[PDB]
Amino acid sequence: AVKIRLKRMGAKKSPFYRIVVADSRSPRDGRFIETVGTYNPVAKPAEVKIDEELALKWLQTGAKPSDTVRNLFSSQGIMEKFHNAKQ
Amino acid sequence: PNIKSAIKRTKTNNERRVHNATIKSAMRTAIKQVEASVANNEADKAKTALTEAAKRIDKAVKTGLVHKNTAARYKSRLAKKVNGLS
Amino acid sequence: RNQRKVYQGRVVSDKMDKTITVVVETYKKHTLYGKRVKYSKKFKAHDENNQAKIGDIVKIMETRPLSATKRFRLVEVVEEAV
Amino acid sequence: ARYTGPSWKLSRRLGISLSGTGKELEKRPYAPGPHGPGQRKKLSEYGLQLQEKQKLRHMYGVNERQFRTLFDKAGKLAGKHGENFMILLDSRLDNVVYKLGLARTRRQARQLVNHGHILVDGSRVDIPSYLVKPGQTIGVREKSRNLSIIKESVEVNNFVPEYLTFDAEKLEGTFTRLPERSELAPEINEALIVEFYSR
Amino acid sequence: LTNGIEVTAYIPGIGHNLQEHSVVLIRGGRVKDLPGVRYHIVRGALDTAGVENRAQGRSKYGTKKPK
RNA sequence: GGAGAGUUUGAUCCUGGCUCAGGACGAACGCUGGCGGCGUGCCUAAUACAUGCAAGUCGAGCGGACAGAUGGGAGCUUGCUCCCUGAUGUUAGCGGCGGACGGGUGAGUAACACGUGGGUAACCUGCCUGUAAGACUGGGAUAACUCCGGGAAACCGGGGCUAAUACCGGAUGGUUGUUUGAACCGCAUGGUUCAAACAUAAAAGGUGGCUUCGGCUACCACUUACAGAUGGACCCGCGGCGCAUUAGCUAGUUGGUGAGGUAACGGCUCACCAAGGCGACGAUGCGUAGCCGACCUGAGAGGGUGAUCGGCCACACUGGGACUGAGACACGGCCCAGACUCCUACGGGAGGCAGCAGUAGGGAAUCUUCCGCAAUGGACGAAAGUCUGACGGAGCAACGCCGCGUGAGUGAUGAAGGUUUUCGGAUCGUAAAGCUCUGUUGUUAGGGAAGAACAAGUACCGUUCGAAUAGGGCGGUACCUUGACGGUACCUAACCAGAAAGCCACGGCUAACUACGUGCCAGCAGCCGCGGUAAUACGUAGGUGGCAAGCGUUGUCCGGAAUUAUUGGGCGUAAAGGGCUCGCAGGCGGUUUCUUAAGUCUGAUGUGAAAGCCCCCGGCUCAACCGGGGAGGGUCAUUGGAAACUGGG
């Protein structure tokens, strides 16, 4: 299935993450479908960039975000727009 | 096999093979009957055999043993040869 | 409706039933020296009625494989051989 | 690594004062070792280019790899290659603290910086090669405002260049603008340096 | 050599301890004036001892630093 | 955006090679060696592998065992004891999903394998979203568990019993098949929509709540159709190695008819017909090689490389085969054959590190039989959670890049001592010593992150189901829980200049000279060349120079090399005109006009993944490094235009 998940970038001890749309089977740091944003958990506060338009497009196609990405989308208010669109 | 799951998969694999063979054999048997009834020109038996051939073919598809396209091809082939009788 | 590759070319063989060997010719630049060289590509085409004879300038369109080597169909015979 | 050997002989070998004051060329203004006094030999073009390179390098106390890498960086900047190169060398933190007069010599300065006695915009920076940028304020940490050695330098020091500004009361300097090379050591013929590396 | 090739190798330095069956390490480098001598034996590698009493350019002759 | 130098001679100019100054590395070797950050580390034997781990999960699909025990009887020693089936718990087995991903290697492969641009009206797609319609009625088995035989066991056969969301009939179905009508539209086969008849083909329950106990309902699961998304399959244009001391190759080969087979076109296979197909625009054969993004080099054109990271392909002890499945002809699956290895009681069994560590061997040469699932990502589950040698960390190696140390100031009396000396002196030399100063680092204390987002669980809000004021789903909102790294980073304080500099070179190219020993010996050497009793070239010593926790040597690639010259060279005498003609193919071709639009130029559109190189910003104390935004890139494709030149008429 198509997932919205975190790709780990950066270096030892300084993790940086891209939110990419990817087939579940693909390796974590390998083939992906489309980049949707970035996530820097080490910074204070965690910097989060998301492209709403793209995020919603995939959510509506049925790509499920991973647990952490789901948390990100909630705090950014992406899940609200998704629920409301379906109603 | 080394992994416990692999051992069960080997047993399961052979059991499913046996069952499928019965189902696939019956389906082929039915096709043969229809082809026999066309060589000797017997519409009624051929026409009733064709229903039985259709039965067997579609039964294999329900389970998944034969692909939809493969079944369609068989049925088309058999149905046209039966029209040749009349 | 996407279009297939078209090739205007010249028939070179017609000895096979329903099959013509078209050839397409063009000037391609040489990779290192830049001189334009004659490049010729042969194509097997399908023509059911055997219209095109050896020498005709025929237009062919790409198709699904029709045999081991045939991948095109004769569309028209633009100019018949004299 | 960092040259911890005798200082004067470098000045003597190069025929310029590396401290800028003069005192290394008073008694023996000639190369070190027993062949210095007698010999008055002339240098080839390669010798002159190399000698000029060593003039700038030893003045600022930088190793060759770091020195050469910095030269390439100046390369990309707009304007005169040699001029830009010398601006970067002056921007080194150990140099800037020395020019502001917190240390009598560059070696002393570098040890102040290396040991962590300097602040740059309130934050500790213990790296001599730090490339001070225009606007930043160089200060001494509170723990080291009252170091004997730095007090000495602040009194004796005269003439802080025009591109810098200093406040002996607060012990905090500012890098207000770029040198522009008119202010910088004229002994150096930067033209030779650019040539030296084109080899 | 381990690849079956037979080569002539020059032994640099003053004096050596090589005999037949000594296992040695060779490196590239011809000896200009020795026809057919195209390799050097590395002093101080495998059986070849360093050079005795060598004090300058020791690294080139496999001589450890004396005290 | 492009530098040259030495060397043929008595001297010179040319030609011509050789050598050197630069950059790079998965490097190795010698000497030496303080630390930190970030990367990298079997390049050879795709050689053989001891040992441990690397794929499980679900009790909310199913039965049976085993515990657990609220209470009843219980027999008596107040010491315990059963015998149900409490709840509850555990799972050997059946069943579902997973195991086709993740991970490894580069042996094979010169090929639609790969790159690029298209095409499929010749295709398939579990899980994931959306839409719509359902989930009716019956039945027979079988593992587990028991008993028999073989076997030391492992394990291997037979008789009997029992369940399912396992399996199988029948009912109703929009798919599918046959036949028949229409409507419209393509690129030949044709495509899309509607309609009719006939024939086939579905499904499953589980958990919780509420019930008048019939059942209703939410969620998960199940069946069918249609879309979407994702993934895969096939075809085609073009591109990318050497050899002609490899010239003919092919016989299902090349087409056709028919049948079979495939998810699907197709000699894909077969039978029957015809003799065709490929090739000097390099077929065939031999050799060599995974391909690419990219990386190194260069002014560029080019040349080299294809390690780390990403994409695709191929492979899994060797060879073949098929089964299960949405997906394999399957690394840790099965069958057969071969090579090899292991256990044994000699009855019979068992295995495949090119998974992570590790061992042996080969080699000049490359690591720990480590910690943790805390983070990220997978598989299973309703969830808790289980699994995960993917991954996140730590360990070893100066292997590489970056950063910082090994002290700072003053200091002549220019001390002692070493070296040299024309014996005056010079030189190591402000260098020591002395006085003062610092604590990066080290040592010792104290404090100490971030990386953590969560989830479940309840409690509220909105909304959606529902009979519900029940209970769920979806979104929002409190509260709680969790760190391998690691008491690491980082911070603070105190003590101590104390522990922390080596390597190569100094005749010219090339920055850096003297003394002594040696006497064509010992030796040196990248090139010219040194050395045969005054060696700045050998060895040592002093000093100096170039670098610096590195420094040299060797090996490999590019440059310099215009030395394969497209950019950008030559052939009278330096190497180089065929002994000469005729001539097939090929290459090239006079002038005017018209036409065409293959080459050519041009507009628009599409495409050239991420990382990387370049530009601009920002975060690590700086730098390396990390991150964001752009730029750039093709003899590319679709579709218009121009007509001077080339090509066709």
Three-state SS annotation for C14-78: EEECCEEEEEEEEEEECCCCCCEEEEEEEEEEECCCCCCCCCCEEEEEECCCCCCCEEEEEEEEE
With tokens 């740091």, the residue in question is: A29
Coil vs helix vs strand at D47? helix
Whether the CB-CB separation of D117 and D128 falls below 8 Å is answered with no
**Rounded to whole angstroms, how far apart are CA atoms C41 and D2?**
70
Whether the CB-CB separation of A38 and A47 falls below 8 Å is answered with yes
Q: Peptide bond preceding A65: is omega within 30 degrees of 0, i.e. cis?
A: no
Longest Cα–Cα distance in chain C: 45
Q: Is D19 exposed, middle or buried (0-12, 13-18, 19+ CB in 10 A)?
A: middle
Report which DSSP code applies to D142. G
**B58 CA → F62 C1’, Å:** 29
Coil vs helix vs strand at C10? strand
User: Which amino acid, one-letter code, is at D164?
Assistant: L
C-beta neighbour count of D21 within 10 angstroms: 9
Coil vs helix vs strand at D168? coil
Chain F positions with an atom below 7 A of a protein C-beta are 3, 21-22, 29-32, 34, 37-39, 55-57, 93-99, 101-103, 118-130, 167-170, 175-179, 186-189, 199-203, 224-225, 228-231, 234-240, 252-257, 260-268, 275-279, 281, 302, 309-312, 323-326, 330, 332-334, 351-352, 362-364, 375-379, 390-394, 401-410, 414, 419-420, 426-431, 436-440, 450-455, 462-464, 474-477, 491-493, 497, 501-505, 509-514, 522-529, 539-556, 566, 586-588, 598-600, 609-610, 614-615, 619-623, 625-628, 635, 638-639, 646
**Rounded to whole angstroms, how far apart are CA atoms A8 and A39?**
10
Whether the CB-CB separation of D148 and D136 falls below 8 Å is answered with no
Q: Are strands A2-11 and A64-65 parallel, antiparallel or unpaired?
A: parallel
CA atoms within 13 A on the CB side of D92: 24
Q: Are strands D137-140 and A34-40 parallel, antiparallel or unpaired?
A: unpaired
Report which DSSP code applies to D131. B
What angle do helix axes D148-156 and D106-115 make, rounded to 10 degrees? 140
Of how many residues is chain D composed? 199
Q: What is the DSSP string of A6-75?
A: EEEEEETTEEEEEEEEEETTS-TTS--SEEEEEEESSSSS-EEEE-HHHHHHHHHHTPEEPHHHHHHHHH
Q: Subunits touching B (CB < 8 Å, at least 3 pairs)? A: none
**Rounded to whole angstroms, how far apart are CA atoms C30 and D141?**
70
Q: Is the shortest CB-to-strand distance from C82 to strand F under 7 Å?
A: no
Q: Which of residues 27-66 of A touch strand F (CB under 7 A)?
A: 27-31, 33, 35, 38, 40-42, 44, 46, 49, 60-64, 66
**CA distances for B32 relative to B38, B40, D137, D154, angstroms:** 10, 13, 97, 111
C-beta neighbour count of A10 within 10 angstroms: 11
All residues at 6 or more sequence positions from E4 whose CB lies less than 8 Å from its CB, including other chains: none
Q: Is D1 exposed, middle or buried (0-12, 13-18, 19+ CB in 10 A)?
A: exposed
Kindly state the tokens that stand for D161: 């260049």
Closest of D134, D96, D142 to residue D116, by C-alpha: D142
Judged by C1' against the alpha carbon of D105, the nearest nucleotide is F409
**Rounded to whole angstroms, how far apart are CA atoms C65 and A52?**
45
Judged by C1' against the alpha carbon of A51, the nearest nucleotide is F628
Dihedral sign of CA atoms A32, A35, A36, A40 in order: positive
All residues at 6 or more sequence positions from C71 whose CB lies less than 8 Å from its CB, including other chains: C43, C44, C62, C63, C64, C65
Cβ-defined contacts of E20-23 (< 8 Å, 24+):
E22/E47, E22/E48, E23/E47
**D22 CA → F423 C1’, Å:** 34
Whether the CB-CB separation of A20 and A7 falls below 8 Å is answered with yes
The runs of H, that is alpha helices, within chain D are 8-14, 45-60, 64-76, 81-91, 93-100, 106-115, 148-156, 190-198
All residues at 6 or more sequence positions from B38 whose CB lies less than 8 Å from its CB, including other chains: B46, B81, B82, B84, B85
Q: What is the DSSP string of chain E?
A: -TTS---EEE--SS-----TT----EEE---TTSTTEEEEE-TTSTTPPPPTT--SSGGGGT-PPP-
Kindly state the tokens that stand for C69: 């080597």
**Rounded to whole angstroms, how far apart are CA atoms D26 and D12?**
10
Kindly state the tokens that stand for E21: 């069956």
Whether the CB-CB separation of C6 and C57 falls below 8 Å is answered with no
Kindly state the tokens that stand for A61: 């196609």
Kindly state the tokens that stand for A84: 């409301």
Q: Is the shortest CB-to-strand distance from C50 to strand F under 7 Å?
A: no
**Rounded to whole angstroms, how far apart are CA atoms A64 and A5?**
9
**CA distances for D119 relative to C14, D18, D60, D113, D130, angstroms:** 90, 26, 20, 9, 12
Whether the CB-CB separation of A3 and A17 falls below 8 Å is answered with no
How far is C-alpha B33 from the chain's CA centre?
A: 12
What angle do helix axes D93-100 and D81-91 make, rounded to 10 degrees? 70
Coil vs helix vs strand at D118? strand
Coil vs helix vs strand at D92? strand
Kindly state the tokens that stand for D34: 């027993």
Q: Is the shortest CB-to-strand distance from B32 to strand F under 7 Å?
A: no
Whether the CB-CB separation of D137 and D120 falls below 8 Å is answered with yes
Whether the CB-CB separation of D118 and D96 falls below 8 Å is answered with no
**Rounded to whole angstroms, how far apart are CA atoms D21 and D11?**
11
Report which DSSP code applies to D159. -
C-beta neighbour count of A44 within 10 angstroms: 7
Closest of E6, E19, E27, E4 to residue E49, by C-alpha: E19
Judged by C1' against the alpha carbon of B78, the nearest nucleotide is F177
Q: Subunits touching A (CB < 8 Å, at least 3 pairs)? A: none
* Residue burial B46-81, b: 16+ Cβ < 10 Å; e: rest: beebbeebbebbebbeeeebbeeeebeebbeebeeb
R_g of chain B, CA atoms, integer Å: 17
User: Which amino acid, one-letter code, is at B23?
Assistant: I
